[PDB]
């Protein structure tokens, strides 16, 4: 069987319903008249043009069959996060978006599984919303990797991680609100450069701060897009931790020892990159993810893993094995 | 023989000489009374503590012997660049720093080779200063990877690159003035996260803009610290260029075809990282560099390459071969 655990949705959101939250920065979905194309829109600006598969759960199951993917986990498009908003307005919006998600997963909840979003800019509202959603049916939460200038070392974000680790709630960490200000203007560089760095920063933020020494080993946490550039740059981190007391102060073990404490999806779009990745993470902590349905997500879902020189057991774990232990799937 | 082509110096600069340029932003060297320790200082603030090898070319040759490195190329500590300054002041400062460099390399110019800095914020002054310096003895120029919000795609920086390509001047591109604003506060995250992303952005900036289709093939250009995270994330770039017309518009060939047009140093601090790197770049475009004398530079210079499963011939090219064609060292 095949489980793709990194994919996204966007719900049937009217201009009128989103304007009631923020007729300026609440995102909404405009579908064409035919009904197989459309755009995500902030106020009345065009944000991203999207395909029917993003919002239509029936059309999506049909593609899932063409693709040979049996169960697919899916979660909010990072533009739905609303972390910049006021906390009550975001807790309201999060509640609707996760309802929409169960509504979307209704089309076939043995094959479509959902992850919820939280108002992460408020620890209390984020914690209650995380537990409600798992009880309502979501298999876990998906969070942006940072919150303005708070990275995952921030005490509040660590508190949200521990809360989930204690309630045995799995977490997918997604790059979002990328760094870099005004420089990565064209050629989609924010996805090519800033996305991988954002992820690496999140992972390194937990490690070098000692967060893993303080968070329960029971936390199920996954970092998207191969964990950014983390695995390739890990040796540069180990060498700095050995040669610099300020790198070493909050981190008792050498940083590569902590790879036993988190997961990554397999989306790295290259056999060499994939082989190095499992070499660092181990075949048990790499899962099949595709970033479906966006252009940048590997058309042939699972094709990179299946054509690899990896073990037949390694393939089985990335394709299916680890994603069902991680998410508790039949 | 061994050639380490990535290393740095800092000259004997007094508080008062630096104050005549900017008693606020000009860096200077304070040596202890003993004289084997010291600090780089901006105005009156402590910037980096350094050790004798950074400024003492005699002490350095002695360590060069202990380390078994025959010739070492060296260049300015990126804090010396002064790209934020007024152009004439910076052209004045660059001229003194490159004189200092030849003064430093005087201690033994058959083992210490130098690269010059330029006032890159002024294309004319940068071009004259680049040619000046090569004629005075430098083997080429070292530049920060970006200039505020101008990346190597910027037409000024492209004009500086082709000026050098036409005068057959080699270029080492160094990450500097790292992105990330206020987030990577502690654990030296700017060196771990932002430095590799800066490099990757520079390389990708030339490729995806078509700069390599417009710059003469004769350009000898090298990117530091293994070219950042570029070689690992290259497949993500290829896949984006195939699936997105806006990634593809300015770039006629698929982006991984352009690895035949630049070099990288070998400083990636890991055998798997190193093996993937030469797999992407080819054994001919990877050169031994150590970032000596900073804490984060592999104290066993060349030790990573020599202990690798790479070919006897690959080792000879990285250790010695490529760095002497590139730099014209006999
Ligand atoms: Co995604
Ligand atoms: Co350096």
XYZ file of N, CA and C in Angstrom, chain A residues 146 148-149 151 153 179 182-185 187-189 191-193 195-198 200-201 204 208-209 225 228-229 232-233 235-236 239-240 243-244 246-247 250 268-269 272-273 276 295-296 298-299, chain B residues 146 148-149 151 153 179 182-184 186-189 191-193 195-198 200-201 204 208-209 225 228-229 232-233 235-236 239-240 243-244 246-247 250 268-269 272-273 276 295-298:
288
model
N 7.743 28.734 12.112
C 8.118 29.840 12.967
C 6.945 30.801 13.082
N 6.790 34.789 13.237
C 7.541 36.028 13.206
C 8.985 35.719 13.534
N 9.495 36.266 14.634
C 10.890 36.060 15.005
C 11.058 35.021 16.100
N 11.391 31.237 16.816
C 11.615 29.950 16.188
C 11.227 28.865 17.180
N 12.670 27.148 19.134
C 13.276 27.204 20.457
C 12.453 28.054 21.425
N 11.838 33.806 5.330
C 12.816 34.868 5.495
C 13.277 35.386 4.141
N 13.288 41.303 0.676
C 13.066 41.830 -0.655
C 13.929 41.164 -1.725
N 14.674 40.094 -1.398
C 15.695 39.644 -2.337
C 15.240 38.545 -3.278
N 14.393 37.627 -2.839
C 14.064 36.505 -3.715
C 12.779 36.831 -4.475
N 12.935 37.794 -5.391
C 11.858 38.431 -6.140
C 11.283 37.522 -7.226
N 11.751 33.856 -10.141
C 12.051 32.437 -10.349
C 11.641 31.532 -9.179
N 10.672 31.958 -8.358
C 10.192 31.175 -7.203
C 11.316 30.790 -6.251
N 12.360 31.617 -6.175
C 13.442 31.406 -5.212
C 12.970 31.195 -3.775
N 10.701 29.336 -2.648
C 10.498 27.899 -2.517
C 11.799 27.130 -2.674
N 12.748 27.657 -3.454
C 13.986 26.932 -3.747
C 15.049 27.165 -2.677
N 15.124 28.385 -2.145
C 16.175 28.784 -1.215
C 15.647 28.911 0.210
N 12.530 28.262 1.708
C 11.839 27.086 2.232
C 12.816 26.103 2.851
N 13.862 25.629 2.166
C 14.748 24.661 2.813
C 15.466 25.220 4.026
N 15.833 26.502 4.000
C 16.532 27.091 5.132
C 15.603 27.234 6.322
N 14.377 27.695 6.087
C 13.390 27.768 7.154
C 13.252 26.428 7.864
N 15.436 23.762 7.969
C 16.697 23.522 8.669
C 16.806 24.342 9.949
N 16.375 25.615 9.898
C 16.390 26.477 11.079
C 15.506 25.925 12.190
N 17.234 22.742 13.634
C 18.386 23.171 14.400
C 17.976 23.958 15.636
N 19.873 22.652 19.037
C 20.934 23.428 19.669
C 20.470 24.152 20.917
N 19.167 24.243 21.138
C 18.613 24.874 22.326
C 18.432 23.899 23.477
N 9.517 18.657 3.315
C 10.463 18.872 2.217
C 11.848 18.366 2.591
N 14.223 20.301 4.745
C 15.039 21.283 4.073
C 16.418 20.762 3.765
N 17.413 21.623 3.965
C 18.811 21.306 3.727
C 19.488 20.711 4.957
N 22.075 17.500 4.681
C 23.322 17.772 3.973
C 24.256 18.673 4.795
N 23.700 19.635 5.542
C 24.499 20.578 6.313
C 24.796 20.107 7.729
N 26.852 17.951 8.968
C 28.253 17.871 9.346
C 28.834 19.224 9.688
N 28.409 20.254 8.964
C 28.829 21.598 9.314
C 28.353 21.971 10.717
N 30.599 19.952 13.322
C 31.937 20.510 13.441
C 31.931 21.838 14.195
N 30.850 22.602 14.096
C 30.784 23.869 14.815
C 30.535 23.639 16.295
N 33.777 22.811 17.971
C 34.833 23.813 17.918
C 34.428 25.151 18.513
N 33.303 25.203 19.199
C 32.757 26.473 19.639
C 31.884 26.239 20.866
N 30.017 28.303 22.449
C 28.694 28.940 22.385
C 27.716 28.113 21.544
N 28.213 27.309 20.590
C 27.351 26.370 19.866
C 26.957 25.217 20.785
N 24.006 24.954 25.218
C 22.680 24.443 25.539
C 22.444 23.038 25.003
N 12.579 15.303 -1.840
C 13.851 15.983 -2.060
C 14.204 15.959 -3.546
N 13.413 15.206 -4.327
C 13.401 15.280 -5.794
C 14.726 14.873 -6.433
N 20.264 10.868 -5.274
C 21.400 11.092 -4.392
C 20.984 11.785 -3.112
N 20.205 12.858 -3.247
C 19.667 13.536 -2.080
C 18.858 12.577 -1.225
N 21.379 10.051 0.621
C 22.002 10.726 1.755
C 21.010 10.938 2.890
N 2.328 22.596 -8.236
C 3.257 22.301 -9.350
C 4.580 21.695 -8.917
N 5.096 22.113 -7.763
C 6.442 21.760 -7.347
C 6.492 20.473 -6.523
N 6.543 16.757 -7.503
C 6.719 15.425 -8.108
C 5.366 14.928 -8.616
N 5.225 14.956 -9.946
C 4.017 14.455 -10.585
C 3.761 13.015 -10.173
N 26.516 39.020 -2.189
C 25.419 39.927 -2.495
C 25.751 41.327 -1.983
N 23.534 44.188 -0.366
C 22.209 44.587 0.081
C 21.176 43.666 -0.554
N 20.290 44.230 -1.376
C 19.248 43.442 -2.008
C 19.559 43.093 -3.449
N 21.444 40.670 -5.825
C 22.097 39.377 -5.883
C 22.885 39.294 -7.185
N 22.434 38.156 -9.873
C 21.722 38.421 -11.114
C 21.734 39.907 -11.475
N 21.312 37.087 5.407
C 19.887 37.296 5.577
C 19.430 36.786 6.936
N 16.494 39.253 12.616
C 16.551 39.153 14.065
C 16.397 37.726 14.593
N 16.378 36.700 13.727
C 15.960 35.377 14.191
C 17.118 34.500 14.648
N 18.233 34.500 13.933
C 19.280 33.533 14.253
C 20.235 34.163 15.263
N 21.312 33.088 18.594
C 22.400 32.362 19.235
C 22.758 31.070 18.509
N 23.716 30.359 19.114
C 24.324 29.112 18.643
C 25.016 29.241 17.289
N 25.388 30.456 16.876
C 26.034 30.689 15.577
C 25.192 30.174 14.407
N 23.869 30.193 14.557
C 22.987 29.865 13.446
C 23.280 30.635 12.151
N 26.015 31.144 10.725
C 27.007 30.377 9.985
C 26.451 29.035 9.558
N 25.494 28.505 10.319
C 24.978 27.161 10.066
C 23.826 27.159 9.061
N 22.963 28.168 9.120
C 21.758 28.234 8.306
C 21.882 29.246 7.169
N 24.544 31.251 6.066
C 25.708 31.154 5.188
C 25.451 30.188 4.029
N 25.008 28.942 4.253
C 24.775 28.058 3.101
C 23.654 28.534 2.186
N 22.616 29.165 2.733
C 21.533 29.682 1.901
C 21.996 30.869 1.049
N 22.735 31.806 1.653
C 23.365 32.882 0.895
C 24.136 32.357 -0.318
N 23.939 29.320 -1.906
C 22.974 28.724 -2.824
C 22.234 29.795 -3.628
N 21.815 30.878 -2.960
C 21.093 31.957 -3.643
C 21.954 32.618 -4.708
N 22.242 30.047 -7.659
C 20.952 30.009 -8.333
C 20.625 31.345 -8.994
N 19.395 30.858 -12.885
C 17.992 31.025 -13.269
C 17.726 32.341 -13.987
N 18.666 33.275 -13.933
C 18.563 34.549 -14.623
C 19.122 34.501 -16.038
N 32.335 27.294 0.909
C 31.644 26.392 1.823
C 30.819 25.365 1.061
N 27.457 26.210 -0.370
C 26.321 26.115 0.530
C 25.569 24.824 0.351
N 24.238 24.930 0.384
C 23.328 23.809 0.233
C 22.943 23.551 -1.218
N 22.818 19.694 -2.836
C 21.756 18.841 -2.299
C 20.376 19.284 -2.805
N 20.116 20.589 -2.852
C 18.798 21.069 -3.261
C 18.662 21.212 -4.768
N 18.085 19.114 -7.167
C 16.968 18.430 -7.780
C 15.660 19.160 -7.564
N 15.491 19.755 -6.393
C 14.327 20.597 -6.177
C 14.280 21.733 -7.195
N 13.312 20.208 -10.670
C 11.912 19.852 -10.754
C 11.036 21.083 -10.849
N 11.445 22.183 -10.224
C 10.663 23.409 -10.300
C 10.766 24.049 -11.676
N 8.393 22.347 -14.070
C 6.971 22.363 -13.765
C 6.431 23.766 -13.601
N 7.208 24.771 -13.961
C 6.785 26.138 -13.699
C 7.426 27.031 -14.752
N 7.464 30.189 -14.960
C 8.153 31.362 -14.428
C 9.529 31.025 -13.864
N 9.764 29.769 -13.457
C 11.119 29.337 -13.117
C 11.955 29.181 -14.388
N 13.791 32.696 -17.983
C 15.112 33.250 -18.254
C 16.195 32.180 -18.338
N 32.656 20.901 3.454
C 31.287 20.497 3.753
C 31.246 19.622 5.005
N 32.433 19.225 5.486
C 32.623 18.655 6.829
C 31.888 17.330 7.016
N 29.697 11.898 3.357
C 28.532 11.775 2.491
C 28.250 13.066 1.742
N 28.224 14.182 2.471
C 28.109 15.483 1.827
C 29.168 15.656 0.745
N 28.390 13.274 -2.392
C 27.310 13.855 -3.193
C 27.780 15.096 -3.934
N 37.486 29.067 13.964
C 37.118 27.832 14.669
C 36.372 26.842 13.803
N 35.521 27.323 12.892
C 34.585 26.480 12.156
C 35.158 25.956 10.857
N 36.467 25.677 10.765
C 37.064 25.302 9.489
C 37.789 23.968 9.290
N 37.510 22.941 10.089
C 38.261 21.676 10.014
C 39.708 21.954 10.413
